[PDB]
Design a binder for this molecule. Sequence first.
Ligand SMILES: [K+]
Ligand SMILES: [K+]
Ligand SMILES: [K+]
Ligand SMILES: [K+]
Ligand SMILES: [K+]
Lengths: 291, 291, 291, 291
Amino acid sequence: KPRILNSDGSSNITRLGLEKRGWLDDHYHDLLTVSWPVFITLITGLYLVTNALFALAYLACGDVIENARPGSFTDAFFFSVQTMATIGYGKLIPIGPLANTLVTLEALCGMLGLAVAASLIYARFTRPTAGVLFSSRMVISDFEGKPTLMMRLANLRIEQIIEADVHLVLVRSEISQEGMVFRRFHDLTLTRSRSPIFSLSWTVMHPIDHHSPIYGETDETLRNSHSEFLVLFTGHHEAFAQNVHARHAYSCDEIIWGGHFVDVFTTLPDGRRALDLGKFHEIAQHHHHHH
Amino acid sequence: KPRILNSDGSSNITRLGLEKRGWLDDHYHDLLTVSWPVFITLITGLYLVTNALFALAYLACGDVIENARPGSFTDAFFFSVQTMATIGYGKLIPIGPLANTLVTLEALCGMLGLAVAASLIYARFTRPTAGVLFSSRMVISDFEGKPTLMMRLANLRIEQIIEADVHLVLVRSEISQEGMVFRRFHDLTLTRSRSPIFSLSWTVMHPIDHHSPIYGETDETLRNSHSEFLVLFTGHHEAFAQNVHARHAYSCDEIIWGGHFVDVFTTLPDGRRALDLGKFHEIAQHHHHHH
Amino acid sequence: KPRILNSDGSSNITRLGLEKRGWLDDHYHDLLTVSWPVFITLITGLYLVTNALFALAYLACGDVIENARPGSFTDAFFFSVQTMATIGYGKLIPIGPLANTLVTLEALCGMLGLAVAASLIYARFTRPTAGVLFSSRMVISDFEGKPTLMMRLANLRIEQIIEADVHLVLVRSEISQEGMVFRRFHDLTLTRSRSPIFSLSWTVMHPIDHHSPIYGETDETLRNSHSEFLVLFTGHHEAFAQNVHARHAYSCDEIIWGGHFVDVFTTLPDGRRALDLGKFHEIAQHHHHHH
Amino acid sequence: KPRILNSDGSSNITRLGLEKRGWLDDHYHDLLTVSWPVFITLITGLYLVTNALFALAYLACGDVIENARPGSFTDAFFFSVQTMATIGYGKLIPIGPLANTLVTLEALCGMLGLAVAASLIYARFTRPTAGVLFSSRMVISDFEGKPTLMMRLANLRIEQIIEADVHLVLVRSEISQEGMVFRRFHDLTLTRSRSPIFSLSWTVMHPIDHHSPIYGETDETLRNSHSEFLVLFTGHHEAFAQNVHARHAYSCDEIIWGGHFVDVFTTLPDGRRALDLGKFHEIAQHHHHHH
Ligand SMILES: [K+]
Ligand SMILES: [K+]
Ligand SMILES: [K+]
Ligand SMILES: [K+]
Ligand SMILES: [K+]
């Protein structure tokens, strides 16, 4: 069967045809999703193709610019870069009314061009990534006398995330009395969804009790309903002093029945007590005697 | 009867005044509610008419501006545009004390002008709109063996909204023991008010059970209390990595009794599984045999 | 008796002696609490007394500045304003090493001076006031068969506040088994503390039931315990697209026993249905036949 | 035994790596954790060494810069500082194509340099610290006829913190039926975890009742499980009109059994009613008669 939700928690559902688009959305992804090196280019290019134009625009007025060359674009281009950046050496001042007036316009442009450039540079500086690692598998094993759906996540940074909240949601196809078959979401009660200070590792646990949406359920029954599990994480990072988000999705076949995450708090004294994320996806299992 | 609440959730009540108004409110709507093209004008005009004034202010000092023309506004205007944007080609330097002093003043003006012009450009850049679509009607039909008040909303963009919250509120006129008739608000319990990842479509449902404020009601009883329904949606948008929200209101005559929304996750394989918002306001109903 | 809490919800408690102070606190009240006109001054003054200094600093190097006058402060001052604002007409360029080097320093100054000026101008633009009016009195009258502590608040603006939360807290002196007398806070359950869309008026109500901290309490008993009531309001304003806060405090003698707020939704058709805040503090009472 | 949690709530666990690091994290601590005086250096240096380079880059083009000195770095350096800050006196204008081209580049650099320099100045300006003081010890004494775990915190500033939230968490080593020994976290219910207006002092209390994770425990049993207590405080600060938070941790040997904090609201009339934080860490204890 196909994955409804990818592993990164992204919907694999197709959307239908043209209809819609916004700007703070438009003027915001292509410009704030690409790596800085890319971003700088996207602005360096914009920066130059605006000058080059105002340069064309100048030369389009004649031999206006004072002390420049006749029709030389590599003389008007420079006048713009000196006019827009509000540098104005003076040695190349505008001439007449068309120029001067175009100036008041080019500089105003480089003004907002500074503002905009600044807004963006800040929107970006404020889209902190979570730095949260999710275990590659899930497991269902006994804990405190009950079968327990588990999974864990770790902080890949030395800065603390405070007020961390984890949501573990079951998503399967069900059918109602009205015989209607629908996709449904279930908020699995975790023995702890709020963690005051997320610093190192955290194992989220769902005790499968008579009150659980997956009570008396097996790998088979789960697959039948095309069961999937979504995990959303959020918290206030201390590093950026801002909010942070992270999600991941699991499939039925990513659940190791009988598994046990191996202890990551591997305290090896000879220097200090530590945490090892090298063992983070490690899962213990009991194998049964073949014949 | 009239609509207490408009379709977009805006109150249709009249307010009585001549009293009070603020500034971060004043200096914020007329300036941050209008489309960018409009916004640009509102600043392009403020830009020039301040220059134009400072030009008037210069000429008013006499034949001061060195290397300009006598009383020519079309020469002092350009000096301001050159002084404010802090360009200063030099060929038109100030003259004396009144000028220079006016300069240190004009330039400072264009300074904050940059600041202000920046704050704004940012405030705006951060008032994301939520592209949430609300269905034109509501429906009361059976779901899980119970009459259920339903309505739905869709994400008009490809970006995901994290931590979505919907509130469906009944607002009607009631009467207390003290014989007082008051407009009351009722928070209807939904079979689910928090959505982890609002990605495609969502049908909000209110099971009308013996605990419901509309239990045993009918279109007639609902109209009598002049019942209305308000819906508030909020969520963290991944596009702008910011918060977003939306509201909408419905009246009694917008509730199709017996209706069923038509499935939108119209999976037409031959390419992929999808979602169609063309069928979003589509409601199925049983028609009774005429005689 | 003295007011522990003023009417605006401010503590009237004295703090003891010197010890402590921060900067984002220092560099933040004196500069962001004063009215804009004041703010502009505080920056206009800073702006000038920095130039005037760099001017002194220049003249302190000798007859350096080119094309200026000997020892004339009203010639170096202007050089700074032309150097800091990064204008640089050129006609007065620096001279030697001390000057030029001082320049690289003055301009860098006017740089951060732009940044800082910008940060602040934005912090300010983002300290939205609530615009929430609290009724001057409180009342205790029957509602739905029970004695009910009430009070109301109104939105003094045409923009909606969404997700409004009101907290009504009783604060009195109590004594424990250990015979210890302490000041205590009580969260009074309101028949509704969360309001999805605060637009016009809202009457907060505390049903005094056997579960109430003021059950079987009288004006006298309340005064004895020096009872006070605090009300905190918060919500997401749509206007500034930011959070908003407002608080107020009431005394025992600001509670009208037997009172009834008068209806503010005074619907006078002949034009439309309205809201009148002129009647907001109006309270009805039944007077008893004197003899 | 060692402290799993430091006094300031920082984890004292070792992390194992050579793996991963980010940028809005990189370009954010070394740059936004250091005191302003330090911050100013970190930029004043970056400012000059970029200028100095562009100077080297110019001279590397030969005797280009018009009106300068042959191969003199102390002439091209000043040209950059004049080109970057977009000053451009003009007397030192670029020369040819390599220069001018380098200009449009340098100036653009000083542009973003302004942007970046601005974002940062703002990020910082918005990482408010909470001036919350935590008591050095905790105490378990009787309150309302029950052993109660207590601790307290004070506001070190005159600004009010709105919507204060405190979480007091027990963290100890426990063992499950499956014979697994795990470090568990316990959210102790406080007789009050949310404070409307955190203005002076606050004594957080945990009634040790039959429902408490430390019911029937003793200093010895607590030490055996290597019990620790973590406290997280958060709130909206009115000073910066922003959010703030603080954490602190206590170990078993920091719990005074039988202790009582001494009253801090030391009301000494002869001027006014106050609060003394000099007695904040003051704990009273009964001493048993020696023989
Ligand atoms: K300039
Ligand atoms: K010049
Ligand atoms: K400039
Ligand atoms: K210049
Ligand atoms: K010149």
